[PDB]
Each structure stands twice: as structure tokens, then as C-alpha cells.
Design an enzyme around this catalytic site. Structure first.
Site, PDB file in Angstrom:
ATOM      1  N   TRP A  80       6.300 -10.072   8.091  1.00 42.95           N
ATOM      2  CA  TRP A  80       5.721  -8.880   8.711  1.00 42.95           C
ATOM      3  C   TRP A  80       4.613  -9.198   9.715  1.00 42.95           C
ATOM      4  O   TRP A  80       4.158  -8.289  10.417  1.00 42.95           O
ATOM      5  CB  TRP A  80       5.172  -7.929   7.631  1.00 42.95           C
ATOM      6  N   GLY A 114       2.963  -0.166   9.513  1.00 43.72           N
ATOM      7  CA  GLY A 114       1.880  -1.120   9.349  1.00 43.72           C
ATOM      8  C   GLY A 114       0.504  -0.489   9.139  1.00 43.72           C
ATOM      9  O   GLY A 114      -0.522  -1.078   9.516  1.00 43.72           O
ATOM     10  N   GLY A 115       0.450   0.699   8.534  1.00 45.37           N
ATOM     11  CA  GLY A 115      -0.836   1.332   8.250  1.00 45.37           C
ATOM     12  C   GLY A 115      -1.678   1.753   9.452  1.00 45.37           C
ATOM     13  O   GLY A 115      -2.873   1.987   9.289  1.00 45.37           O
ATOM     14  N   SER A 196       7.093   4.088   7.193  1.00 47.16           N
ATOM     15  CA  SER A 196       5.675   4.029   6.789  1.00 47.16           C
ATOM     16  C   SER A 196       4.822   4.752   7.828  1.00 47.16           C
ATOM     17  O   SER A 196       5.072   5.947   8.071  1.00 47.16           O
ATOM     18  CB  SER A 196       5.303   2.569   6.529  1.00 47.16           C
ATOM     19  N   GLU A 323       8.209   2.032  -4.254  1.00 43.29           N
ATOM     20  CA  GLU A 323       7.265   2.062  -3.134  1.00 43.29           C
ATOM     21  C   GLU A 323       5.924   1.379  -3.448  1.00 43.29           C
ATOM     22  O   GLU A 323       5.320   0.749  -2.569  1.00 43.29           O
ATOM     23  CB  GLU A 323       7.001   3.515  -2.710  1.00 43.29           C
ATOM     24  N   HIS A 436       8.673  -1.260  -0.966  1.00 48.88           N
ATOM     25  CA  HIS A 436       8.321  -0.660   0.315  1.00 48.88           C
ATOM     26  C   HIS A 436       8.705  -1.569   1.475  1.00 48.88           C
ATOM     27  O   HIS A 436       8.324  -2.740   1.502  1.00 48.88           O
ATOM     28  CB  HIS A 436       6.813  -0.389   0.322  1.00 48.88           C
TER      29      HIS A 436
END
Ligand SMILES: *[C@@H]1O[C@H](CO[C@@H]2O[C@@H](C)[C@@H](O)[C@@H](O)[C@@H]2O)[C@@H](O[C@@H]2O[C@H](CO)[C@@H](O)[C@H](O)[C@H]2NC(C)=O)[C@H](O)[C@H]1NC(C)=O
Ligand SMILES: *[C@@H]1O[C@H](CO[C@@H]2O[C@@H](C)[C@@H](O)[C@@H](O)[C@@H]2O)[C@@H](O[C@@H]2O[C@H](CO)[C@@H](O)[C@H](O)[C@H]2NC(C)=O)[C@H](O)[C@H]1NC(C)=O
Ligand SMILES: *[C@@H]1O[C@H](CO[C@@H]2O[C@@H](C)[C@@H](O)[C@@H](O)[C@@H]2O)[C@@H](O[C@@H]2O[C@H](CO)[C@@H](O)[C@H](O)[C@H]2NC(C)=O)[C@H](O)[C@H]1NC(C)=O
Ligand SMILES: C#CCN1CCN(CCCOc2cccc3ccc(/C=[N+](\[O-])C(C)(C)C)nc23)CC1
Ligand SMILES: *[C@@H]1O[C@H](CO[C@@H]2O[C@@H](C)[C@@H](O)[C@@H](O)[C@@H]2O)[C@@H](O)[C@H](O)[C@H]1NC(C)=O
Ligand SMILES: CC(=O)N[C@H]1[C@H]([C@H](O)[C@H](O)CO)O[C@@](O)(C(=O)O)C[C@@H]1O
Ligand SMILES: *[C@@H]1O[C@H](CO)[C@@H](O)[C@H](O)[C@H]1NC(C)=O
Ligand SMILES: *[C@@H]1O[C@H](CO)[C@@H](O)[C@H](O)[C@H]1NC(C)=O
Ligand SMILES: [Cl-]
Ligand SMILES: [Cl-]
Ligand SMILES: [Cl-]
Ligand SMILES: [Cl-]
Length: 527
Positions: A80, A114-115, A196, A323, A436
Site C-alpha cells: 500500500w 488511505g484515510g 475506504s 473490516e 479491509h
């Protein structure tokens, strides 16, 4: 040689061989002025035309961001991390078109997650060449600004108005509206999809009036704006801006003079101070995220959703069975990706402090009360599994179900899925389950590549998902009509039917996590 005339100049692509066919890829097409210098923190600015031939033959720079360093050398986390140089000069996008050039292809636009602090469109699991080859759609993905550089907010101030990364996304949707017909695409048939924070972004485009005319339909994988991490109050946003200003030495009485001081700081000083801008953080902290800016987002989005103020269209929404487990190995005591993580009651209660730092004692006991009524209290993984479900139900599953309920109440077709297949190649341990982010490689069709280590049953599953996603984008209806598949029923607020995705047998089920989501969605907001 394949050269396409766009509104701002010619771009050159490259031919790729995929499954005994050909796909044309245009990687790293710029869609805005580089947001450097006095442009840092402002909305993205339009591009001046060029006269040469822009070579779009490799991924562009990813946007500045901190990097996950918890597991150096481990593929489960490092897959990631960004795979191109980080730079502020990152406003670029990619296009995959079938060969030969299509005549009026439906367009699918990916928004990564990615928040809102991390992510890039160049990751291996986001490669659109397979969808283009197999379904003959066009795939577009863009890089957008993240962290403080994408979402710093001085509400009302054009030097740092907030939501800059969302306007980055919007300018790329506009690029598709104005240019994709020259690639063979249909700008009247565009489906956004994301996962996400990418999915939360898709849901906010459904609410933003400036995005209304820029897409047709929407797919939300494991996220929605009503998730507790996805929107930042103007209260916290201002406290967070000033805290960063203090940390870099940029405290000034004139608010605009703060922004100017922050604009003479190197990107690395900004990045290193983002984390401590909040008094107590969690593995799910979104230090700088979307705000109610009065521009992209005209009101608090819970109010817009409740009162029906969104684009009326079809949506596809879903979640993964486990998740929550991925976040447990980033701080919860007794957890480790390298053992079975059997925790005690005491460790469980400490895990709740880590994930709910600002919640009252009574608030935390009520979580414990609701999730520790075992059938067999001898089962040693009881507490380990309870904490996973807590984190996933609160942060992803119950918000996505509530979004789908409210949206469908205004008359549109919605379709909900429950993905429960654990990849045979998943590098994380078995106790973490169906994690997730690990449906994405099935959506993009990586298991259709026989050369990897996926099973035959996973090829079959991915092939079916790819057809359902493409049929949704083209026709608004995610059926697989040819191979005697299970019909996917519409999600209604009454019966609340959903479809399970697995290699064994797809089933129609009702009222996912009904008891758990009544706790999170009705009771817990009061505490
Ligand atoms: C490409 O196709 C469009 C039609 O798109 C379809 O209709 C939309 C409403 C949406 O449901 C999409 O998912 C569909 O795929 C053609 O649009 C027509 O354009 C002409 C002239 O511009 C106009 O007079 C018609 O009313 C349009 N038809 C519709 C249904 O809107 C477009 O012409 C096609 N382009 C090419 C080059 O084939
Ligand atoms: C709003 O911010 C203040 C200030 O934050 C402190 O300074 C920043 C530069 C950064 O380093 C933060 O992590 C610091 O906490 C917060 O005030 C602090 O709050 C904590 C606990 O809440 C306390 O221990 C500190 O002494 C406080 N410091 C000061 C100077 O008051 C404040 O809590 C933030 N507001 C909210 C609602 O969290
Ligand atoms: C599972 O592992 C955690 C983490 O242990 C770390 O990883 C290994 C290399 C291990 O051998 C240790 O060197 C590392 O600390 C264990 O949690 C630790 O437990 C000890 C108690 O002996 C405690 O002092 C530490 O603070 C704990 N560390 C953390 C991060 O919480 C845990 O006990 C292991 N569980 C099982 C069932 O084996
Ligand atoms: C994986 C994992 C766990 N890690 C957590 C911490 N993260 C540290 C940097 C910020 O990430 C995030 C911060 C906050 C909320 C977040 C919500 C969702 C995600 C999702 N994803 O990141 C992907 C796209 C699935 C990889 N990330 C969030 C790195 C990932
Ligand atoms: C853009 O590309 C032009 C064509 O060169 C192509 O790329 C090279 C690397 C070979 O792999 C082959 O596919 C092509 O011949 C160049 O002539 C041109 O200089 C390039 N522009 C810039 C700015 O580098
Ligand atoms: C930050 C960054 O990625 N910069 C540039 C890199 C490097 O400067 C060199 O490859 C040496 O590292 O090189 C390019 O010009 C290239 O060769 O295609 C692309 C890019 O703009
Ligand atoms: C802050 O400085 C800018 C530029 O000098 C000026 O335009 C603005 O009016 C000032 N505002 C205040 C409140 O001093
Ligand atoms: C339907 O079944 C055939 C069997 O040979 C397979 O080749 C094809 O890919 C399947 N289609 C879908 C959409 O699953
Ligand atoms: Cl400048
Ligand atoms: Cl309860
Ligand atoms: Cl017990
Ligand atoms: Cl209850």
C-alpha cells in the site's frame, strides 16, 4: 504510435499486451497546474495548453505523504506504500482504453483510499488494464492531494479554504467530461468507484452540487461520509490548523499571514508535524480531512442525507467480513501479525481505550456490555474477535448500511454486498480474516491472470464480480445474466436484502448486523 488530441494538447500512449489482446494506456496526464509556491493549499487551477506531444508513458509522481513504517520488508503493508517519487507536483491522471479504440464506451473513474492522508493511483492493485481488456470499458484514475496539503482548513479563507483534495478529484471528473470522447468514451455514461476514503469521497460527490453533472452512477466499497473518521468539524479543523502553525513556528495574528509562513516551509516539516496536531490519536486518526467549507459541501452532510439533498441515481455499496482486524496490529495491546493474538478481558478493555480515547467510562462499558455476551465463554479467541468486530462495525459496516438505508428512502435503486472471501495469496495471518482492502484485487480482476498464484475458484469469483460491476456502470443493474447466477435484489429500507460474495455459493440474506448497528447508530451517538 497512438496520439490523441485533447483540449490542451496531444498526448502519446503505449500499447500493452493483455490476455492475447491489446490495451492502450496513457499514464501520467496532467489535469491541473502544479500546486506549488503561492498555489500550495489553494484550490487547483486550470491548465495552460501545450504544443509539443506530452509523453504519457509512465506513472507520475505521487502526492506528498507520510509512509507506513510498522513492518519494513513485509508485503502486506508495503503493497500500500507509494510506488513513485513523492512530490507536490502530483496532479496527474491515467487512462486505459480498449484496443481497437471503442466507439462509445462507458467510463469508470477510480478514487483511491488511505484515510485522506495516504494513497496513490499507481498501485499494482489499481491497474485498470484488465477491466479495459475484459469488459471493454474505459478506466480513469487520478492522484489528489492528501494530508494537510490536501485538507488544511481556515474556513472561508481562499488561501486555505479546505477540501482541496476533493476539488482535485472534481477537476479530474471535469477533465473526463471535456476530453474522454476523444479517447472513445461516453461522457454521459460515467461511474465513480472508490474504496475506504475513496468511497467516502464518492459519497460526498453525490452530495456536492458542483459534481452533479460530472457523473452518472456511484459505487462505494467499504466507506461513506457518515463514517466517524470521514468528516472533520470546523471546530477541530481550526484547532488543528493553529496547532500545526504553532509546531512550525508560524503562529501569527493575521490568519492569512499564517498561511504565508506555512507556504515557506519545506514539505517534510509539514509532514512530520501532522501527527501531533491532535492531542490523542488512534490507528484511524484522520488529522486533516473533509470539512463543511461552504463550497464543495454546503451544510453538514448528515443533514443533507437525512433531508434528501443529493443526486438521484443508482448506487452499489458493500463491506468486507473483517473490516476491523487490520487496525488492531497498529496499537492494540497483545496483538501481533506474527502470533494468534489471543487477548484477555483486561487487554480488551485496554484496546477500547486505544480506539475510543475521548469516550467516557460509561461509553466504554456500554461497548463492552454489548460485545461480550458470549455463547461459550471458554472460547479463547472471544475477546480477540470482539475487538475486531467493534472496530469494523463502528468504523465501516454500520455507517455504510445507514448510508444505503437513507439514500434508498428517496426512491432510487440501491444494491448492497457482503464480501467474505479471504484471498489465497493474503500475506497477513489467518486470524485477521477477510480484511479491509482485500476485495480490490478481485474488483480489478487480478485473479484473471492465470500466471499468479490464485486458485481456479478465485478466477471464477473475480470474473463474476467484474461483470457485475461493469453491468452496473453500463446499465445500472449489477446482474450476471448468462451463467445462471443468483439475481441481486434491490436493497429496500424495509426488507434490507443483500448479496454475499464468495467462492462457495452466493446467497441472498437480510438485515446485516442488525443488532450491532442498532447499538452504534442509535445509542452510541448519545454518549
Ligand atoms: C454515445 O451515447 C450517448 C447516449 O448515452 C446513453 O444515454 C444516457 C442517458 C445514459 O443512460 C448512458 O448510460 C447511455 O449510454 C449519445 O447521446 C445522444 O447524443 C445526441 C447528440 O448529442 C442527442 O441528440 C441524444 O439525445 C443523445 N441520447 C441520449 C440518450 O442522451 C451519443 O450521441 C453517443 N455518441 C456517439 C459518438 O456514439
Ligand atoms: C486544541 O489544541 C490545544 C493545544 O494542543 C497542544 O499543542 C499542540 C501544538 C499539539 O502539540 C497538541 O498535541 C497539544 O496538546 C489542546 O490543548 C492541550 O490539551 C491536552 C489534553 O487535551 C493537554 O494535556 C495540554 O496541556 C493542552 N495544551 C494547551 C496549550 O492547552 C486542546 O486540547 C485542543 N482541543 C481539543 C478539543 O482537543
Ligand atoms: C503475541 O505477540 C505480542 C507482541 O510481542 C512482540 O513480538 C514478538 C517478536 C515477541 O517475541 C516479543 O519479542 C515482542 O514484544 C505479545 O505481546 C507482548 O507481551 C509481553 C508479555 O510477555 C508484553 O510485555 C509486551 O508489552 C507485549 N507487546 C505488545 C506490543 O503488546 C503477545 O504476548 C503475543 N501473544 C501470544 C498469544 O503469543
Ligand atoms: C491498511 C491499513 C492500516 N493502516 C492504518 C494506518 N495507516 C496509516 C496512515 C493513514 O491510514 C489511515 C488513517 C486513518 C484512517 C484510515 C482508514 C482506512 C485506511 C485504508 N487504507 O489505508 C487502505 C487503502 C485499505 C490501505 N487508512 C486509514 C496505514 C494503514
Ligand atoms: C516523447 O517520445 C518520443 C518518441 O520516443 C518514444 O519513446 C522511446 C523511449 C521509445 O521507447 C519509443 O517507444 C518511441 O520512439 C520522443 O521522440 C520524444 O523526444 C519524447 N519527448 C520527451 C520530452 O522526451
Ligand atoms: C521527482 C521526480 O520523479 N523527478 C523526475 C525523475 C528523476 O529526476 C530522475 O529519474 C532521476 O531520479 O526523472 C524523470 O524526468 C524521467 O527520467 O522520466 C521524471 C520525473 O519528473
Ligand atoms: C492580513 O494581511 C493581508 C496581506 O497583507 C491583508 O490583505 C489582510 O487584510 C490582513 N488582515 C488582517 C486581519 O490584518
Ligand atoms: C460464463 O461461463 C463460461 C464457461 O466457459 C466462462 O468462460 C465465462 O467467462 C463465464 N462468464 C462470466 C461473466 O462469468
Ligand atoms: Cl510562487
Ligand atoms: Cl447494548
Ligand atoms: Cl470472560
Ligand atoms: Cl441497545
Amino acid at each position: 504510435d497512438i496520439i490523441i488530441a485533447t483540449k490542451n494538447g496531444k498526448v502519446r500512449g503505449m500499447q500493452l499486451t493483455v490476455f492475447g489482446g491489446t490495451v492502450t494506456a496513457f499514464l501520467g496526464i496532467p489535469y491541473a497546474q502544479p500546486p506549488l509556491g503561492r498555489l500550495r493549499f489553494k484550490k487547483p487551477q486550470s491548465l495552460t495548453k501545450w504544443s509539443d506531444i506530452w509523453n504519457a508513458t509512465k506513472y507520475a509522481n505521487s502526492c506528498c505523504q507520510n509512509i507506513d513504517q510498522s513492518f519494513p520488508g513485509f508485503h502486506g503493508s508495503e503493497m500500500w506504500n507509494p510506488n513513485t517519487d513523492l512530490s507536490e507536483d502530483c496532479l496527474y491522471l491515467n487512462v486505459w482504453i480498449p484496443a481497437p479504440k471503442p466507439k462509445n464506451a462507458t467510463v469508470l473513474i477510480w478514487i483511491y483510499g488511505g484515510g485522506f492522508q495516504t494513497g496513490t493511483s499507481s498501485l499494482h492493485v489499481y491497474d485498470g488494464k484488465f477491466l479495459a481488456r475484459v469488459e471493454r470499458v474505459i478506466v480513469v484514475s487520478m492522484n489528489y492531494r492528501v494530508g494537510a496539503l490536501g485538507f488544511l482548513a481556515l474556513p472561508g479563507n481562499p488561501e486555505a479554504p479546505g477540501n482541496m483534495g476533493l476539488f482535485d478529484q472534481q477537476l479530474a471528473l471535469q477533465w473526463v467530461q471535456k476530453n474522454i470522447a476523444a479517447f472513445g468514451g461516453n461522457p454521459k455514461s460515467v461511474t465513480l468507484f472508490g474504496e475506504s476514503a475513496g468511497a467516502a469521497s464518492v459519497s460526498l460527490h453525490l452530495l456536492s452540487p458542483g459534481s452533479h453533472s460530472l457523473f452518472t452512477r456511484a459505487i462505494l466499497q467499504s466507506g461513506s461520509f457518515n463514517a466517524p473518521w470521514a468528516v472533520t468539524s470546523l471546530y477541530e479543523a481550526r484547532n488543528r490548523t493553529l496547532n500545526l502553525a504553532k509546531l512550525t513556528g508560524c503562529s501569527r495574528e493575521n490568519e492569512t499571514e499564517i498561511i504565508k509562513c506555512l507556504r515557506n516551509k519545506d514539505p517534510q516539516e509539514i509532514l512530520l508535524n501532522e501527527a501531533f496536531v491532535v492531542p490523542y490519536g488512534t490507528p484511524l486518526s484522520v488529522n486533516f480531512g473533509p470539512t463543511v467549507d461552504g463550497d464543495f459541501l454546503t451544510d453538514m452532510p448528515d443533514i443533507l442525507l437525512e433531508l434528501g439533498q443529493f443526486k438521484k441515481t443508482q448506487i452499489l455499496v458493500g463491506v468486507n467480513k473483517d473490516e476491523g482486524t487490520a487496525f488492531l496490529v497498529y496499537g492494540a495491546p497483545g496483538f501481533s501479525k506474527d502470533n494468534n493474538s489471543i487477548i484477555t478481558r483486561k487487554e480488551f478493555q485496554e484496546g477500547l481505550k486505544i480506539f475510543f480515547p475521548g469516550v467516557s467510562e460509561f461509553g466504554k462499558e456500554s461497548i463492552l456490555f454489548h460485545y461480550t455476551d458470549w455463547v461459550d465463554d471458554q472460547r479463547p479467541e472471544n475477546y480477540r474477535e470482539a475487538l475486531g468486530d467493534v472496530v469494523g462495525d463502528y468504523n465501516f459496516i454500520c455507517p455504510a448500511l445507514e448510508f444505503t438505508k437513507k439514500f434508498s428512502e428517496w426512491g432510487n435503486n440501491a444494491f448492497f454486498y457482503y464480501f467474505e472471501h479471504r484471498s489465497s495469496k493474503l500475506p497477513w495471518p489467518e486470524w485477521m480474516g477477510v480484511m479491509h482492502g482485500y476485495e480490490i484485487e478481485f474488483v480489478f480482476g487480478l485473479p484473471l491472470e492465470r500466471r499468479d498464484q490464485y486458485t481456479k475458484a478465485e478466477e471464477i469469483l473475480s470474473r463474476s464480480i467484474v461483470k457485475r460491476w461493469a453491468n452496473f456502470a453500463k446499465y445500472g443493474n449489477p446482474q450476471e445474466t448468462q451463467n445462471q447466477s443468483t439475481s441481486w435484489p434491490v436493497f429496500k429500507s424495509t426488507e434490507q436484502k443483500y448479496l454475499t460474495l464468495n467462492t462457495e455459493s452466493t446467497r441472498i440474506m437480510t438485515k446485516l448486523r442488525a443488532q450491532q448497528c442498532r447499538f452504534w447508530t442509535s445509542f452510541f451517538p448519545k454518549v
